[PDB]
Amino acid sequence: SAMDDEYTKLLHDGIQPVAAIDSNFASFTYTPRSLPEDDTSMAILSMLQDMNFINNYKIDCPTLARFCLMVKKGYRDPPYHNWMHAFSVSHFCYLLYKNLELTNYLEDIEIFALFISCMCHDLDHRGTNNSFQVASKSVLAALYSSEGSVMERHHFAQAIAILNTHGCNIFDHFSRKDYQRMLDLMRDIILATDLAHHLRIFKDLQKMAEVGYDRNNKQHHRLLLCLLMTSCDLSDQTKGWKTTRKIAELIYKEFFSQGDLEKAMGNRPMEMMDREKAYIPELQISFMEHIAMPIYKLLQDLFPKAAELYERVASNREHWTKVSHKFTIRGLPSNNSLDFL
Numbered sequence: 498s499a500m501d502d503e504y505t506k507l508l509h510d511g512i513q514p515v516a517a518i519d520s521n522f523a524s525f526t527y528t529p530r531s532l533p534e535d536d537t538s539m540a541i542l543s544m545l546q547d548m549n550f551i552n553n554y555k556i557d558c559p560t561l562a563r564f565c566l567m568v569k570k571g572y573r574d575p576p577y578h579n580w581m582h583a584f585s586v587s588h589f590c591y592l593l594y595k596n597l598e599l600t601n602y603l604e605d606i607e608i609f610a611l612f613i614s615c616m617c618h619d620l621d622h623r624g625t626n627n628s629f630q631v632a633s634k635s636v637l638a639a640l641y642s643s644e645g646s647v648m649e650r651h652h653f654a655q656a657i658a659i660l661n662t663h664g665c666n667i668f669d670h671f672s673r674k675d676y677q678r679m680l681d682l683m684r685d686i687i688l689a690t691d692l693a694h695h696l697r698i699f700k701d702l703q704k705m706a707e708v709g710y711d712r713n714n715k716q717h718h719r720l721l722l723c724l725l726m727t728s729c730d731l732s733d734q735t736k737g738w739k740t741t742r743k744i745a746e747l748i749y750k751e752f753f754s755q756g757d758l759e760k761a762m763g764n765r766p767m768e769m770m771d772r773e774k775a776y777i778p779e780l781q782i783s784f785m786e787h788i789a790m791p792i793y794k795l796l797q798d799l800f801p802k803a804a805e806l807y808e809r810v811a812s813n814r815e816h817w818t819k820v821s822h823k824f825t826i827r828g829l830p831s832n833n834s835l836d837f838l
């Protein structure tokens with residue numbers, strides 16, 4: 498009944514103009530996690546409208562309203578992999594569209610697929626990684642472990658199950674070829690969110706950047722969609738220091754909860770998931786240096802207007818070194834007690 502009332506307003510009230518969400522809503526400086534969660538579904542509609550996807554693809558408004566609410570309802574509430582993560586990832590896709598001239602690189606249907614994939618790309622996440630699915634013999638590993646990217650295959654399958662819910666197929670008027678194309682793009686883009694996939698294709702991304710993007714090269718389109726998806730997925734790191742500090746807290750809370758479950762199963766967790774061994778500053782610097790910084794450098798190499806994103810990530814990485822000393826206990830604890838020994 499709650500979704501029904503939310504649906505009724507979303508459909509009949511009208512789509513708010515994107516500028517009424519916030520004055521800097523289309524800026525790389527805007528933090529979409531500042532928007533109250535109760536306003537995010539309308540914000541999704543506003544972005545789809547402002548990108549002209551509703552008109553261009555003649556999307557049925559009742560179907561779109563139901564679809565957006567169903568996607569939102571398809572996320573659980575772990576500390577990090579929740580609807581506010583998917584919303585902020587989608588918002589960054591919108592920022593790329595508004596700031597980087599994607600229509601000079603990608604087909605319209607590819608840009609639309611990227612945005613919809615962003616909304617769906619972590620559907621039904623349980624706060625555990627792919628290794629945990631296999632180690633815990635979960636149902637998801639039973640379905641997908643032979644293929645790899647267990648969680649990402651589940652996210653895609655959940656997106657399809659939403660489309661296959663009566664009243665929710667935003668694409669059901671597409672031609673057969675266009676429908677097939679959209680679902681194939683969603684498959685490739687969602688599976689691209691597995692960081693292991695990113696690391697496998699990284700040298701191909703570098704080679705594409707070095708030689709120059711070729712808009713007539715079908716493999717270049719595919720590689721660019723992967724890089725853009727990853728850039729949206731990691732985009733919290735392109736914001737201010739306070740955003741990245743909070744996101745670190747949410748990440749480690751989720752990771753350490755997984756590690757607690759592994760220890761209760763008799764398995765030694767990954768160091769980054771073991772609250773007794775993980776040293777957060779060192780781990781964030783390693784993640785920033787080896788994963789996040791190279792991604793935004795590739796993006797800057799392909800889009801010179803993305804330079805500010807890379808500089809922000811590098812700045813945040815240097816901030817971690819500046820605060821590292823605070824993880825050492827100087828003097829006595831604030832309670833004046835050594836009881837923790």
Ligand SMILES: Cc1cc([C@@H]2CN(C(=O)c3ccc(F)c(I)c3)CC(F)(F)C2)n2ncnc2n1
Nearest residue numbers: 692730731732733734745748769780781783784
């Ligand atoms: C925006 C953002 C997203 C993520 C993670 C990265 N991921 C990892 O597997 C991972 C790999 C190597 C590492 F050294 C660490 I630490 C984590 C996957 C994910 F957990 F889904 C989200 N982190 N992690 C730290 N700061 C982040 N900021």
Ligand SMILES: [Mg+2]
Nearest residue numbers: 618619690691
């Ligand atoms: Mg994911």
Ligand SMILES: [Zn+2]
Nearest residue numbers: 582618619730
């Ligand atoms: Zn994600």
